[PDB]
Amino acid sequence: APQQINDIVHRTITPLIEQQKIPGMAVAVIYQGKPYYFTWGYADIAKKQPVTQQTLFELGSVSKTFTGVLGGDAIARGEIKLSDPTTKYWPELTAKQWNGITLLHLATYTAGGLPLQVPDEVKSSSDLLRFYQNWQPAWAPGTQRLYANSSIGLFGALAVKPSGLSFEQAMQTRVFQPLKLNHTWINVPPAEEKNYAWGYREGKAVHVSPGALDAEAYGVKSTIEDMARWVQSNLKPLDINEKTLQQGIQLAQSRYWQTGDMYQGLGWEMLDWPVNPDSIINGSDNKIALAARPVKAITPPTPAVRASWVHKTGATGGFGSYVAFIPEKELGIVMLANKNYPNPARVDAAWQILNALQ
Numbered sequence: 001a002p003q004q005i006n007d008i009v010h011r012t013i014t015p016l017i018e019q020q021k022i023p024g025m026a027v028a029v030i031y032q033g034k035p036y037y038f039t040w041g042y043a044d045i046a047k048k049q050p051v052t053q054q055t056l057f058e059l060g061s062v063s064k065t066f067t068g069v070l071g072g073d074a075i076a077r078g079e080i081k082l083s084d085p086t087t088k089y090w091p092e093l094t095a096k097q098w099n100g101i102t103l104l105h106l107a108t109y110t111a112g113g114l115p116l117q118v119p120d121e122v123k124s125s126s127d128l129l130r131f132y133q134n135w136q137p138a139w140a141p142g143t144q145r146l147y148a149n150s151s152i153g154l155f156g157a158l159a160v161k162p163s164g165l166s167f168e169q170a171m172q173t174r175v176f177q178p179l180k181l182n183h184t185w186i187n188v189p190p191a192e193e194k195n196y197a198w199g200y201r202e203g204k205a206v207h208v209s210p211g212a213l214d215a216e217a218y219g220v221k222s223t224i225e226d227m228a229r230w231v232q233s234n235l236k237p238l239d240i241n242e243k244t245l246q247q248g249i250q251l252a253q254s255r256y257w258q259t260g261d262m263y264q265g266l267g268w269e270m271l272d273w274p275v276n277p278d279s280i281i282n283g284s285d286n287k288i289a290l291a292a293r294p295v296k297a298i299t300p301p302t303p304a305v306r307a308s309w310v311h312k313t314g315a316t317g318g319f320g321s322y323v324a325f326i327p328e329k330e331l332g333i334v335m336l337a338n339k340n341y342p343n344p345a346r347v348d349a350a351w352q353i354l355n356a357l358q
């Protein structure tokens with residue numbers, strides 16, 4: 001690790017860990033295409049297990065970038081189209097409010113007010129059908145963005161239906177395996193449980209619990225090394241040998257909607273680089289990121305812009321993650337922590353690091 005990288009990373013992350021009381025953290029910087037790794041603290045405070053480059057963290061909503069790319073791969077395979085009605089893949093969805101709601105709307109949170117969470121009362125699949133049938137939009141499709149697991153989660157589930165594969169099976173065979181993400185899991189296998197960090201919420205060790213559409217919206221667990229490889233793959237999609245996957249990655253970074261200075265991709269969110277750091281820092285506060293905001297359609301979508309800050313924040317009850325990269329600079333960062341700490345602290349740290357290296 002070049003001393004410049006070592007210095008900027010430690011000078012930024014050390015105070016962050018102290019200020020936020022983060023039990024364990026892993027960081028990867030991608031600089032001129034090569035990864036550099038940093039670890040601090042504890043994956044398991046009780047058993048005194050350190051964070052290592054093999055520790056698994058819950059990605060929370062960074063999982064949506066995998067769902068977005070898997071959907072993009074399905075488009076590239078010709079199995080689905082973003083301009084297809086939701087009811088083409090779920091014929092049982094007969095309620096008339098679904099007329100005009102497309103897979104694009106589901107993938108980009110623009111269906112008209114689908115809620116942030118699937119109600120915990122929904123367990124069975126007939127519960128899920130009932131929930132979506134009875135849901136009443138607040139807005140017409142394609143007019144307002146409201147960040148929602150019930151939106152992109154349904155997209156992920158529907159996008160794999162023509163393949164006949166389960167969501168987890170599709171993700172493993174079409175995304176994880178081709179990219180050699182061999183320590184990235186929807187369900188952590190017994191063989192890897194020793195590497196699975198505990199999350200910490202108010203001092204209690206916690207793991208994410210099962211829920212409806214959890215795999216599609218917030219269910220991936222990964223190591224810092226696999227996540228660095230995920231960033232490298234999205235920084236340089238053309239190096240990828242599987243044709244539909246290379247195409248799907250590009251599709252997930254296309255710009256479909258604009259609100260303020262942010263653009264909505266499939267999972268990924270993008271801003272023009274150079275960014276105003278106060279825009280992404282304040283913009284990452286959940287108060288703005290989770291608010292209902294009017295969108296302007298980008299007709300047709302802009303293909304992946306190299307001069308972009310591309311990023312996604314993620315959280316679970318016990319974890320906080322952040323990924324960001326700049327394709328034009330060959331530059332990227334991954335931050336994984338086993339405490340959910342405020343988003344603006346994440347983006348501030350990441351911008352301080354990448355700004356110093358560009």
Ligand SMILES: Cn1cnnc1Sc1ccccc1NS(=O)(=O)c1cccc(Cl)c1O
Nearest residue numbers: 060061208209211217218313314315316317
């Ligand atoms: C649903 N559920 C049940 N058990 N665990 C979960 S996930 C979870 C739990 C607690 C906080 C955040 C999440 N993740 S989230 O809903 O996707 C999300 C919302 C808003 C912002 C982000 Cl950055 C984000 O990740």
